[PDB]
Write an enzyme that holds these catalytic residues in place. Sequence first.
Site, PDB file in Angstrom:
ATOM      1  N   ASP A   1       0.862  -1.265  -0.064  1.00 21.40           N
ATOM      2  CA  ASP A   1      -0.049  -0.016   0.008  1.00 21.40           C
ATOM      3  C   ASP A   1       0.910   1.210   0.157  1.00 21.40           C
ATOM      4  O   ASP A   1       0.548   2.314  -0.368  1.00 21.40           O
ATOM      5  CB  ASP A   1      -1.013   0.050   1.021  1.00 21.40           C
TER       6      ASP A   1
ATOM      7  N   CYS B   1      -3.000   0.664 -13.556  1.00 20.63           N
ATOM      8  CA  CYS B   1      -2.961   0.713 -12.013  1.00 20.63           C
ATOM      9  C   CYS B   1      -3.926   1.580 -11.742  1.00 20.63           C
ATOM     10  O   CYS B   1      -5.071   1.186 -12.386  1.00 20.63           O
ATOM     11  CB  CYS B   1      -1.601   0.999 -11.542  1.00 20.63           C
ATOM     12  N   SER B   2      -4.000   2.221 -10.687  1.00 21.04           N
ATOM     13  CA  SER B   2      -4.953   3.221 -10.659  1.00 21.04           C
ATOM     14  C   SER B   2      -5.041   4.620 -11.309  1.00 21.04           C
ATOM     15  O   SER B   2      -5.892   4.876 -12.362  1.00 21.04           O
ATOM     16  CB  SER B   2      -5.117   3.844  -9.134  1.00 21.04           C
TER      17      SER B   2
ATOM     18  N   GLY C   1      -2.508   4.602 -14.045  1.00 21.55           N
ATOM     19  CA  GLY C   1      -2.089   4.271 -15.288  1.00 21.55           C
ATOM     20  C   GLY C   1      -0.729   4.955 -15.543  1.00 21.55           C
ATOM     21  O   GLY C   1      -0.113   4.949 -16.799  1.00 21.55           O
ATOM     22  N   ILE C   2       0.191   5.379 -14.690  1.00 20.42           N
ATOM     23  CA  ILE C   2       1.237   5.895 -14.812  1.00 20.42           C
ATOM     24  C   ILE C   2       2.360   5.362 -13.915  1.00 20.42           C
ATOM     25  O   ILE C   2       3.817   5.417 -14.531  1.00 20.42           O
ATOM     26  CB  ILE C   2       1.239   7.504 -14.889  1.00 20.42           C
TER      27      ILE C   2
ATOM     28  N   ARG D   1       2.845   2.692 -11.267  1.00 22.57           N
ATOM     29  CA  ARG D   1       3.204   1.188 -11.194  1.00 22.57           C
ATOM     30  C   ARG D   1       3.171   0.650 -12.505  1.00 22.57           C
ATOM     31  O   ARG D   1       4.093  -0.158 -12.919  1.00 22.57           O
ATOM     32  CB  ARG D   1       2.297   0.254 -10.368  1.00 22.57           C
ATOM     33  N   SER D   2       2.273   1.195 -13.571  1.00 18.24           N
ATOM     34  CA  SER D   2       1.980   0.730 -14.777  1.00 18.24           C
ATOM     35  C   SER D   2       3.486   1.063 -15.527  1.00 18.24           C
ATOM     36  O   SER D   2       3.734   0.244 -16.357  1.00 18.24           O
ATOM     37  CB  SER D   2       0.858   1.590 -15.612  1.00 18.24           C
TER      38      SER D   2
ATOM     39  N   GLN E   1       6.273   7.790 -11.124  1.00 11.99           N
ATOM     40  CA  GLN E   1       5.680   8.732 -10.320  1.00 11.99           C
ATOM     41  C   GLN E   1       6.459   9.501  -9.026  1.00 11.99           C
ATOM     42  O   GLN E   1       6.356  10.132  -8.482  1.00 11.99           O
ATOM     43  CB  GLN E   1       4.297   8.542  -9.994  1.00 11.99           C
TER      44      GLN E   1
END
EC number: 3.1.3.48
Length: 298
Positions: A181, A215-216, A218-219, A221-222, A262
């Site tokens: 998390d 991911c949430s 999309g930048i 973890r993706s 990020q």
Amino acid sequence: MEMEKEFEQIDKSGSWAAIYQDIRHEASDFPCRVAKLPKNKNRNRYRDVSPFDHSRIKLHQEDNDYINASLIKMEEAQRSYILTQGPLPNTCGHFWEMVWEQKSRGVVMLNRVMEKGSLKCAQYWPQKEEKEMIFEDTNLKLTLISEDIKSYYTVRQLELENLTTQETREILHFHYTTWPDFGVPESPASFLNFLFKVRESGSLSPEHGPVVVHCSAGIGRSGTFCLADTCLLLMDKRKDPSSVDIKKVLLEMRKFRMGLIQTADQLRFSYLAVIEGAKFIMGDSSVQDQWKELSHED
Ligand SMILES: CCc1cc(C)nn1-c1ccc(N)cc1
């Protein structure tokens, strides 16, 4: 200079944040006018994460072609990926329409639907075989066929049906379930085993449309997934692990979608993943180890 020696220097100097901030200053900026149209407000999870107009994926409908998704085309690596936000409750139909239209075989998910007590994306696939989903807006039906739940990830077989034609297709859902998390995984071993499972499936092969990765937003973890995959492909293509500069690769990917990677922690992780992936491919099995001392810190 080996990537590994670069990493040791960056770690010694504590300069991950500095290097990350330099990437942010050098990154491309292109318009996203479509994303910002008023009628698309409820199709974006975050106001500051938008697809560039030049690389956005267009839905093939006449109503509203907009989805928060980008085509990342890596010409030298000869691979493409679609990076997208986690679907919203009103964009799950759009998401599967995209999958259908782009001919994707695989979907890669790097988040949990709920994290830190908050909804990070909609439950856009069925959890039970016997309770299929119908997306009435895009005339698609999706059924859960099977799943294989492993310790760090789950693989699902889904059947996606175009209800206009009755054509069906099998989609593979690769769900990395154990990203913390907070922060990033301490070791990239499980994320690399995931990656290699995705590759082993055929989902990244040129007979299919681009894999869909999210991911949430999309930048973040993706971005680590796509960056690690492409850096490894380049190391193999150039037949020289040492000629690949991960910072250049990331800047190239940021031509296609803003914001990829990020945090400085995510940048460090992507480096670790590429180093340990290259070492594994070259014969080092110990980078899969996560031996820990006996501790009960919780
Ligand atoms: C010919 C293969 C190629 C070149 C580029 C830039 N992308 N792709 C590609 C590869 C795999 C998939 N799944 C989709 C697209």
